[PDB]
Amino acid sequence: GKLPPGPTPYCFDQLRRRFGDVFSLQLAWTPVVVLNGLAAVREALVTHGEDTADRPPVPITQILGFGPRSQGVFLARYGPAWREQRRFSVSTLRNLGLGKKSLEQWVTEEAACLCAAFANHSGRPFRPNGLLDKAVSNVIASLTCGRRFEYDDPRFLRLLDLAQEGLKEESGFLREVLNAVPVLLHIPALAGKVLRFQKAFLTQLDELLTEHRMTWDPAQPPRDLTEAFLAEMEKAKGNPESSFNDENLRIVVADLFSAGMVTTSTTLAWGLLLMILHPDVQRRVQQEIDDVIGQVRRPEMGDQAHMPYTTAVIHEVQRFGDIVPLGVTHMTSRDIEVQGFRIPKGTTLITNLSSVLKDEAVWEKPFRFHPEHFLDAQGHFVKPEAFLPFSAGRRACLGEPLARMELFLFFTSLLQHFSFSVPTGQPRPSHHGVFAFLVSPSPYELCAVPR
Ligand code: HEM
Ligand SMILES: C[C@@H]1C[C@@](C)(c2cc(CNC3(C(F)(F)F)CC3)c(F)cc2F)N=C(N)S1
Ligand SMILES: [Zn+2]
Ligand SMILES: [Zn+2]
Known part of the structure; x- marks a missing residue:
């Protein structure tokens, strides 16, 4: 077949309008094919999902204790080691969710702690990012370790700090070079420099896991x-075939922890920013909150079905926010066909989720914050096919149900008790975010006055 034509997200928007939705790139040793638009993304992740659910090899993960039966979930290669951990994490989230609503309970209670932390900042401008991280991180800890940490807990703060630093190491030029040739890691001085913050994050997590193992009562569910x-x-x-071992426990937990801590928090960070840039939208949400919930009763997941506008605003926050523009890299395990073109086995796939969330042929005004993107004339919530912030296919975000819960409960609870605005005397914050593998809002302060 014909190979795709060939010559950051802004750079891909130029290449898409010069070579089409499926073009190719040659990044050093690695052959890369970028997928743009819903059609191209769906065709790879869903139609040929069996052949595109693999991850590109990351040899430097061996420093972090990665083995064949211990690859975690996020970077795990396509196979039994991934499927077993995938199926476990998905089912466990579901089981802890149903029954006594443990998920909903920990989030609701964490929301109240978040509202209280916001209340102590009242009458004074501040950056909401730090508090959002802690509140979001605690929800994860409640699902993993079955506990929360105080916002001033020394080890908790260090855990969050190391996690934030570990994200930057992922986007390092030193990574790709060492990732290409693994024998460079044999250098004792060089090996310690690669992932010093990430290995620190692991060590700190080990200490917490050891403590948890002590308090665990096997006699109870x-x-x-x-x-x-x-x-x-x-x-x-x-059983040497099982992925359930000590080496994998610390990796799987680190995966779940890191993933649903920098994403959900950044989204909420985008959410509050869009609420002070568009106060009219904020008022309508707060109005719907009063008409359905009130101003004293804690928001519940059962309220979402009766709050179409708030649901549209949250979805639009994710869409406009576009926190994971290029998604997470896939790899072809076979030879496939995308949009007519041929894709060789072992080709690194990039899913341009940004091109789907900002598709001008799908969305009415893609480059605007427009809640009506998820509303019809009547006021009913609609979810377009092109809403893929969690990607699609077998590798689609397993944390989406939790994310949906965290987003609705945290966002509604904050707006229920607070009115957010820009601090007078300060410039209107840009709605353009600082690009990375994860797009955070441009640094901003806000005023949170109670109601
Ligand atoms: C706003 C919040 C979130 C967004 C936008 C988001 C987005 C994504 C994206 C784009 C991927 C890559 C999908 C792919 O490779 O095709 C992903 C994968 C993943 N996410 Fe999330 N995520 C969010 C929250 C969470 C949460 C709360 C958790 C866990 C509690 C989580 C855990 C994971 C894991 C483990 C994977 C890898 C799954 C696999 O490789 O099969 N994420 N997410
Ligand atoms: C969801 C995560 C996203 C980032 C960017 C990622 C990775 C780490 C470190 N991950 C570990 C390990 F799992 F590999 F062992 C050192 C503790 C972070 F601390 C933060 C991250 F965002 N990278 C990943 N490979 S998975
Ligand atoms: Zn426990
Ligand atoms: Zn309708």
């Missing part, structure tokens, strides 16, 4: 994902 993991580890003793 697992309170959290780690306890559920530990319970499987005992059953998998004497």
